[PDB]
Amino acid sequence: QKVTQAQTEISVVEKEDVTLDCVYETRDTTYYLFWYKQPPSGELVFLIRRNSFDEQNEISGRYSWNFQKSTSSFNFTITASQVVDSAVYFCALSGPSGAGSYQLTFGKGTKLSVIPNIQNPDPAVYQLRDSKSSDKSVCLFTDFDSDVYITDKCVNSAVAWSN
Amino acid sequence: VVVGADGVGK
Amino acid sequence: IQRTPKIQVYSRHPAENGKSNFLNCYVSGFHPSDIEVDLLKNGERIEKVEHSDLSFSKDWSFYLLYYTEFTPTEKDEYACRVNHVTLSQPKIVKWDRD
Amino acid sequence: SHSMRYFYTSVSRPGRGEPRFIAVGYVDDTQFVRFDSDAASQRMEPRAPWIEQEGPEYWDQETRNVKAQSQTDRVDLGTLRGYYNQSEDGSHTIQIMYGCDVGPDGRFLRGYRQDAYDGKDYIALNEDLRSWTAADMAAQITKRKWEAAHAAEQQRAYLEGRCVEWLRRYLENGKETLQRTDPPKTHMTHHPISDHEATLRCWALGFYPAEITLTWQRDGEDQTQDTELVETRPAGDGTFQKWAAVVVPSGEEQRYTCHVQHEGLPKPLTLRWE
Amino acid sequence: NAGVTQTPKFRVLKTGQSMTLLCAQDMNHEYMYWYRQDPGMGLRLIHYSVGEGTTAKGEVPDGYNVSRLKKQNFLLGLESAAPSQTSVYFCASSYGPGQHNSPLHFGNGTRLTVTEDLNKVFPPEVAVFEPSEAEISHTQKATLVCLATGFYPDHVELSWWVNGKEVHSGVCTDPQPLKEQPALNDSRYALSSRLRVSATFWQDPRNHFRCQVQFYGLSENDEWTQDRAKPVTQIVSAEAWGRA
Secondary structure (H helix, E strand, O other), rough: EEOOOOOOEEEEOOOOOOEEEEEEEEOOOEEEEEEEEEEOOOOEHHHHHHHHOOEEEEEEEEEEEEEEOOEEEEEEOOOOOOHOOEEHHHHHHEEEOOOOEEEEOOOOOEEEEOOOOOOOOOEEEEEEEEEOOOOOOOOEEOOOOOEEOOOEEEOOOOEEEEE | OOOOOOOOOO | EEEEOOOEEEOOOOOOOOOOOOOEEEEEEEEOOOEEEEEOOOOOOOOOEEEEEEEEEEOOOOEEEEEEOOOOOOOOEEEEEEOOOOOOOOOEEEEEEO | EEEEEEEEEOOOOOOOOOOOOEEEEOOOEEEEEEEEEOOOOOOOOOHHHOOOOOOHHHHHHHHHHHHHHHHHHHHHHHHHHHHHHHOOOOOOOEEEEEEEEEEOOOOOOEEOOOOOOOOOOEEEEEOOOOOEEEEOHHHHHHHHHHHHHHHHHHHHOOOOOOHHHHHHHHHOOHHHHHHEOOOOEEEEEEEEOOOEEEEEEEEEEEOOOOOOOEEEOOEEEOOOOOEEEEEEOOOOOOOOEEEEEEEEOOOOOOOOEEEEEEOEEEEOEEEOOO | OOEEEEOOOOEEEOOOOOOOEEEEEEEOOOEEEEEEOOOOOOOOEEEEEEOOOOOOOOOOOOOOEEEEOOOEEEEEEOOOOOOHHHHEEEEEEEOOOEEEEOOOOOOEEEEEEEEEHHHHOOOEEEEOOOOOHHHHHHHEEEEEEEEHHHHEEOOOEEEEEOEEEEEEEOOOEOOOEOOOOOOOOOOOOEEEEEEEEEEHHHHOOOOEEEEEEOOOOOOOOOOOOOOOOEEEEEEEEEEEOOOO
C-alpha cells in the first residue's frame, strides 16, 4: 500500500487549467481514494472520496476527478484557476488492515501557487514613514544583501525594509 | 472470493 | 424465531460389522447457532468427534455434521445426544442401521 | 448452470466480550473456504483440494476483507439492538447470504445479497441489484441510508464483476471435482412390520450434487399415500444420501417400484424387490 | 456536532521538558489518530486507537505515547521533549467499522517548538507605517503597513483594529513568518501585514488604526533569570491616527 503525488510544487497563471497527479499502488480489491485541501491557514478540508468500483469521471464545478483504475491513478484538475485555489492538496488511499479496520496512507502533497495575471501592469514602489520615530520606514511594491529583507507577495503587494 | 466489507453498515 | 433441530444418525457406507466406517449425526433446521452435540457409544461420550463448519439453508436455519471414524459391532449401540435452547432436556436418537 | 455462495454468521456474546463471527464459501454444493473469529489461526482457511493452489496474497486479501466485515457486523449488532430497543444482555444473530450464478454459457444469470436478524428476513438486494426490500421499519431505516450511500453499486460491482471472474476460475481450477456428477448407488431393503404388512425402503447413496427425486409407483401409477422421504443428508465425503420408504401389504412387494432421477444418471432408474 | 477540537493552538518547550497535547471529538467516533506534518514529509501517523481502551503505534511512535481514556478524548504525551519534535500536530477521527468508507475528520492543529535554550525566545517589536502620499495621489487609496520583527517561536496572530473594532475587509497578512537569518535554525522571525483603505478614510483624523500581534511565548511556571523582561504570552501593538 503506497501513494505518490509526483509534483512537489506547481505554480500556474490565474484562470488557466491545472491537473494535480496522484498515482496509488495497493493489492486491495475494495479500497477508497480521498483528496484533501490545506489552504495557507492550515486546516485540512475533505474534498471528495472515490470508491474503487465507481465510474472514472466526475465534474463538481471547477473541480473534476479522473479515476483510471487500469493506470492505477486518480488525477484532480482545476479549470479556470481562482487565487483562493492556492493551497497544499493531499491524495490518500484507504484499504482494510490485518485487524479488519480501514486505515489510509497519504501522499507527500502537491503545493498549488495560482499567480494573479497582471491585467493592469502599473508596478509602483511607495515609501511609508513609521507612525512614531520617522527615522525608521518601509517600502511597498504593487501590481506585478542579507541586511535587506523582502516579504513574499500576498494579494498584489510585497514589503521591503532594512535597519 | 469474498465481497469487500460493507462501506456503510446497517 | 426459535427453531427445534431435526436429528438424523446414520453411517457413511452400508454398515458391515467389523469394518471401519464413519458414524454421522446431521443436526438441521435450528436457530440460534449455539448447540451441544455428543456421539454416544453405549451411552459413553466418544472423545475425538469432529464437526463441519457453521452454514445455514435459504430459510436462515443452521445445519452441522458431527462425524467420528467408528467400527460397527453386532451388539454395540451408537446414539447422538443433542441439547439446544428449544429443548427442555437433551434429545438422544439411537443409530438405526436402516 | 453453476453457483457461488458465501454464508456469514455473527452472534453477540454479552458478558464474554467480542461477538463470534463465522464465514463459509460454497461452489454449487461444495464448501471450499471458511473463517472463524474464535479460531487461533485468525485466517481464511482452505476446505477443498482445488483452492489450496491459491497463493498467500489471495489468503491475506480474503482474511483482511472478511475480518473487516465481522467488525461491521459487530457494530451492526449494536445498531439493530438499538433500532428494536432490545435488552443489553441478549444474544442476537446477523446472518448474511450473497453470491452469483453463471449459465451453461459461463455468463452471469443473477446475483443475491440478503441480511437476516435473529433468523428472520431483515433486508434483501432486489434482482436488479440497484434497489433494496426491507422486512420491517428497522430495516426501512437501513434501506434509506443504503439508498442514500448507493451501497447497492458496491454489491452489484462484485456480483456482476469479481464474483463471476473467480467462480469461473474455481469451476476450471477444480473441474475434476465440481463439474463431475457422481450418480447415485441405489438398492432396496425389506422390513416386515407385521405378518400382513411390510416397509419397502428405496436407498440412494454417494451422489453429487444433492439435487435428486425419489418417487414410489404401484402397478405403474404414482403412489404417495404411506410414502415417507427424509431430508437429503450429507455422506461427509463431498457426496450425499437420501432414502424413500413406503408401507405395502404382505405379498404385494412386486407391484411397488421405486424411481430415481439425478443429473448424474442419463436415463432415470426403476427398482423392484425380489 | 463541533467535530475534532484540539489544544493548545501554539506552545514552546525547553529541550527535556514534558507536555500533553489534548484532543476530543463529540461525533462518537471509534477511530482517533495523532498525525505529524513537517516540510518535505507528508502526514506521518504517530499513534492511533481503534476504540476506547486500546491504542497502537503508527509510523513514527518513538518519543510519543497516547491515552484513549474514554471514547471522546485521545491524548498525546511528550515525556522528554526533543528539538526533533518541533512540528505541527493534527488530531483526527474516523467513524469506525459502522462506516468503513468514512473520511478522516482533522482538528485545527497544534504548532510546537522545542528550543535548547529559552533565552532564544523573544516577543515581537511591532510598528505601523503611514501610507504614501504618492499612493494616495496615484490610486486615491491608502495602504497602512504593519511589521513585527525578531520574535521566536514563529507563534503569532496579527489583527487590524480600526476605531476599537477588528476589521477583515482590505487586509493582507503574510501566510508565512520569514526568518530574519535564513542560515540559522534558531533564527528569529518577522511578519508583515497591509491594510488598504480609501484615501478619504486615512486623511480623516477621527479614524484610529491599531496593528495587534498576539505572541505565544513562555508560561508563568517557566523559570526566568535573564536581565531583560520575561518573554511570556503577551499582545504587542502599534497605532496611528489619520491626518490631512
